[PDB]
Amino acid sequence: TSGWTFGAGAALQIPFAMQMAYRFNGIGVTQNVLYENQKLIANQFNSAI
Amino acid sequence: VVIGIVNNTVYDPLQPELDSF
Amino acid sequence: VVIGIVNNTVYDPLQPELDSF
Numbered sequence A: 001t002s003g004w005t006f007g008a009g010a011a012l013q014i015p016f017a018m019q020m021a022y023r024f025n026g027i028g029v030t031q032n033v034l035y036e037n038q039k040l041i042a043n044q045f046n047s048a049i
Numbered sequence B, C: 001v002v003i004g005i006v007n008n009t010v011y012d013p014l015q016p017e018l019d020s021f
C-alpha cells in the first residue's frame, strides 16, 4: 500500500502500479517500461507466485 | 497502452519565444 | 581524443522550428 515509506516514517499511500514504476527506476529501467508492459509484468508476477 | 492515463496540457517553453519572434 | 568514436548526425529539436520561423 505504501512503498518503502512506512519504513522511513508514516505510510504514504501510493498506487501499486506506481510503486512498481518506482522500483523500475531504481534498477535503471525507465518507468514507461513498467506502464507500457504492466499487464505482462503482472502476469509474470502472478505466475511466479 | 498506459492504464489510467489522464488528459492535460503540457507546456512547451520554446513555443512562446519563437511565437513572439 | 576518443578511441573508437564514430561519425553520425545528431538531431536538434530547436533547428526545424527556428527554420519554420
Ligand SMILES: *[C@@H]1O[C@H](CO)[C@@H](O[C@@H]2O[C@H](CO)[C@@H](O)[C@H](O)[C@H]2NC(C)=O)[C@H](O)[C@H]1NC(C)=O
Pocket (backbone or CB within 6 Å): A040, A043, A044
Ligand atoms: C517478452 O516475453 C514474454 C514472455 O515472458 C512474451 O509474452 C508472451 O507473448 C506471447 C505472444 O507472443 C503470449 O502468447 C504469451 O502468453 C506471453 N506471455 C505472458 C507471460 O504474457 C512477450 O511477447 C515478449 N516480448 C517481446 C517484445 O519479446
Ligand SMILES: *[C@@H]1O[C@H](CO)[C@@H](O[C@@H]2O[C@H](CO)[C@@H](O)[C@H](O)[C@H]2NC(C)=O)[C@H](O)[C@H]1NC(C)=O
Pocket (backbone or CB within 6 Å): B005, B006, B007
Ligand atoms: C482524452 O482525450 C481524447 C481525445 O483527445 C478522448 O478520446 C475520445 O474518446 C471518445 C469516447 O469517450 C471517443 O468517442 C472519441 O472518438 C475520442 N477521440 C479521439 C480523438 O480519440 C479520451 O476519451 C479522453 N480521455 C478521457 C479519460 O476522457
Ligand SMILES: *[C@@H]1O[C@H](CO)[C@@H](O[C@@H]2O[C@H](CO)[C@@H](O)[C@H](O)[C@H]2NC(C)=O)[C@H](O)[C@H]1NC(C)=O
Pocket (backbone or CB within 6 Å): C007
Ligand atoms: C569522420 O569525419 C571526419 C571529418 O569530420 C573525418 O576526418 C578526416 O579524416 C582524414 C583521414 O581519413 C584526415 O586526413 C582529415 O584530416 C580528417 N578531417 C578532420 C576535419 O578531422 C574522418 O575520416 C571520418 N571518419 C569516418 C570513419 O568516416
Ligand SMILES: *[C@@H]1O[C@H](CO)[C@@H](O)[C@H](O)[C@H]1NC(C)=O
Pocket (backbone or CB within 6 Å): B003, B004
Ligand atoms: C480505480 O478503480 C475504479 C473502481 O473502484 C475504476 O473504476 C477506475 O477505472 C480505476 N482507476 C484506475 C486509474 O485504475
Ligand SMILES: *[C@@H]1O[C@H](CO)[C@@H](O)[C@H](O)[C@H]1NC(C)=O
Pocket (backbone or CB within 6 Å): C003, C004
Ligand atoms: C577495435 O579494434 C580495431 C582493430 O581491429 C581498432 O582499429 C579500433 O580502434 C578498436 N575500437 C575500440 C573501441 O577499441
